[PDB]
Write a protein that binds this ligand. Structure first.
Ligand SMILES: *[C@H](c1c[nH]c(=O)[nH]c1=O)[C@H](O)[C@H](O)[C@H](O)COP(=O)(O)O
Ligand SMILES: *[C@H](c1c[nH]c(=O)[nH]c1=O)[C@H](O)[C@H](O)[C@H](O)COP(=O)(O)O
Ligand SMILES: *[C@H](c1c[nH]c(=O)[nH]c1=O)[C@H](O)[C@H](O)[C@H](O)COP(=O)(O)O
Ligand SMILES: [Mn+2]
Ligand SMILES: [Mn+2]
Ligand SMILES: [Mn+2]
Lengths: 307, 307, 304
């Protein structure tokens, strides 16, 4: 029952929810910190349209002038893409201040889940989830995303956890906190730019339909928390393992040596891997995002059907 | 509070006991499928139900049958889980929605069991031993979802402590961090599962059922959610020799690690291997501790229905 | 029910919408030696009263969760000392069940304040990730209470005996805002500064209060850490205080100190190695935090 001075849902999205059309949420960190200009905004508007061509309704989420806004104008997206790193990356602990100081912010997966759940949106597409960082056994550097997944009822379609992270530790972590890690048509956990990895999802499902069904069962039996749907990047756009892993490993060593830490790590690694791959990691990431948007449209349609 | 009959079904017996305020004791399915071999699996489970019956209390064995969460089971069902063994999905919280959605059978761990018991409003649950922090968890992050269920869900779990195959010190630390009281029953020293003693202490030591119940009531009436571990030492008669059992466990652990056994397979492999190495003795101790735990859990049950 | 009692001076302010600031009893029983423990408690209360707000010291007396306390009960906690049960969240129901007395930690003080509707609470410094928690898993339940329960905790940062870096990672993970008051760098407790930074620098109590109402109205449960730099003149010498802390921790490890008794031991050991100066620094930072806390509580009461 939040006040409009706090949360503002755009009329497209409101109508969508009234008329029970399927809605897919999207995040703003990917635009501001995830990718450079103008690939971030092109990518974002285009993801929105992809969703539209699948017959669903996009709601991109962000903090515009201190307001939590569900659905955004082309203008505001252009805005986040131009202002870029100057915009505040917003996780859970960041949110109330960016709302109070009335500033603009780009929501992470955590925040995007929070707001989406506030708006009653169950399906959310992104590129890759945050997770347990390499070295975390000694650094305790662990995304708030995982705790959000533990606690907030949103399904997040992604290409897995970002492959710059520690995937093994991430899979243990998700199990401890009772979060389903669903492979869409895959048992092997997808690694972001790359289609497989040495690890496993917690369950393989071959259709949106079964995922929607699981969601309804899960929530109706009271098990609160979200679900991760790991969606492999299409073969056309997949980075070959050896190259990408070399660029990731170098970028991670460099970040260690340079004392990069905290909320700045992921943007640093993503950009540096893009430098190291000459733009290829970035192209692949954009491809992965469109793909997840498509699957996410199918899942939301299937979920709305049941609900 | 009202869960659909398609998802959740309580036996008529357990329903009359709940209705008529008879003290009910919950029981887990995974003990049967993944914790013991056949016929000992089904045999022990039925003899446990009987044991709780002698105490003048009503057992509800919990499992997933044909996609339904089932509180209370028939002899046929217990037996089916028993003979089906590893063919039955081991079910933790992350697992739960998919077994139920897909109409399958599943054997519930402490976590799943607690979840379901809590749905039927059963506060007392007897098992052999709880999951915990695995040896090597500093680097592996392998930490049972049981401990998280304990953190949030209102059930008392009577056991011989954590399975001796785990890392007990880190478990005690973990429970403190998460606000879960670890109650030694008539001991300040943490019971070791197969062993009565460990070089680790419980958080509170209490000598009667009634105290345990009254502490339950203050805890919940006060709004601190989460369960309680009541660690009940195996009786002196059936205990394992420190030397022999420890050697068995250590070999088993080194072996599991060397073979690369990970995830939900770890515990069932280690129990099997330990039973093998001890020429079945460990198993016999396990059974005996389960009966003991059941008796104590019935007493706490009566004392709880009282207040 | 009868399992929580609120002093009439406290309820009087709650009903009448006046600023209330919580305090913890572990500062007293296990935090500081007698007589300075009771003295510090009473004078902290006074500092609040004079600040324009109403002190409520939470503790468990005769099994009761008590909001606001008599000087008799304060002297009792200060004197009976380490003989009083230290109470965290796991501890709580039993100390109540058994009608015993206990000194509440930041965790339990947050709980109790929450039961009574007190959104603002002042302490010296919170528990956190201990040095070597990476191998020991030794992590205060406080961090979890901050993750979950809605209370603002004003302090000197985390007690500097702990592992602060790990503590900041952990706070991020669990979504708990770490607010530096007029500082980017995380207050180091005895020290005014640390190699670590907070999550946001806020310069005024009002800002913090608006952040509070916006945070909870939005439904994000969990508390807030407000880190208050120790006054410049009371700060310990970095070399002396860190040499002390380091030795004390090395000893604690050697001697098999663990669990709930780890922090009290180290504190006692540190003031001993610093010949009372760290305790003196400690008492000052507590007063300072009580002042900032009063301001926050007032500015927040104004706003909703
Ligand atoms: C990752 C984001 C999603 N997809 C993508 O392609 N690129 C991206 O940068 C998310 O924004 C994620 O929530 C964010 O990285 C959170 O990280 P922290 O652990 O630093 O909060
Ligand atoms: C242990 C269970 C209890 N008693 C017993 O004798 N044998 C057993 O197997 C529990 O089922 C426990 O939850 C199990 O270890 C599952 O834990 P993970 O999810 O960590 O595998
Ligand atoms: C620390 C307390 C706060 N300020 C201060 O000046 N001195 C103190 O002793 C708190 O009591 C803290 O919550 C306590 O350390 C709890 O620790 P554990 O429960 O982690 O042992
Ligand atoms: Mn991080
Ligand atoms: Mn495990
Ligand atoms: Mn501790």
């Amino acid at each position: 029952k939040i006040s409009p001075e706090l949360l503002q849902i755009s009329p497209e999205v409101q109508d969508a929810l009234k008329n029970k059309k399927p809605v897919v949420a999207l995040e703003s960190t990917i635009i501001s910190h995830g990718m450079p200009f103008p690939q971030n905004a092109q990518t974002a508007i285009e993801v929105e349209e992809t969703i539209r061509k699948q017959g669903a309704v996009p709601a991109t989420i962000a903090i515009i002038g201190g307001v939590m806004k569900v659905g955004l104008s082309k203008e505001e997206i252009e805005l986040l893409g131009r202002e870029g790193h100057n915009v505040t990356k917003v996780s859970r602990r960041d949110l109330p201040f960016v709302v109070a100081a009335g500033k603009n912010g780009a929501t992470t997966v955590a925040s995007t889940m929070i707001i989406a759940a506030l708006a009653g949106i169950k399906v959310f597409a992104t590129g890759g989830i945050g997770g347990v960082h390499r070295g975390a056994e000694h650094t305790f550097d662990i995304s708030a995303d995982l705790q959000e997944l533990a606690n907030t009822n949103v399904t997040v379609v992604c290409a897995g956890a970002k492959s710059i992270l520690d995937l093994g530790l991430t899979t243990e972590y998700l199990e401890t906190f009772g979060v389903p890690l669903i492979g869409y048509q895959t048992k092997a956990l997808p690694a972001f730019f790359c289609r497989t990895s040495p690890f496993d999802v917690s369950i393989r499902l071959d259709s949106a339909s079964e995922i929607a069904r699981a969601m309804v069962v899960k929530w109706q039996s009271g098990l609160n928390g979200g679900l991760v749907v790991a969606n492999p990047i299409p073969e056309q756009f997949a980075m070959p393992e050896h190259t990408i892993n070399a660029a990731i490993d170098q970028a991670v060593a460099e970040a260690e040596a340079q004392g990069v830490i905290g909320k700045e790590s992921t943007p640093f690694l993503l950009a540096r891997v893009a430098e190291l791959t000459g733009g290829d990691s970035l192209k692949s990431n954009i491809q992965l995002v469109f793909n997840n948007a498509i699957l996410a449209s199918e899942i939301a349609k299937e979920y709305q059907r049941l609900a």
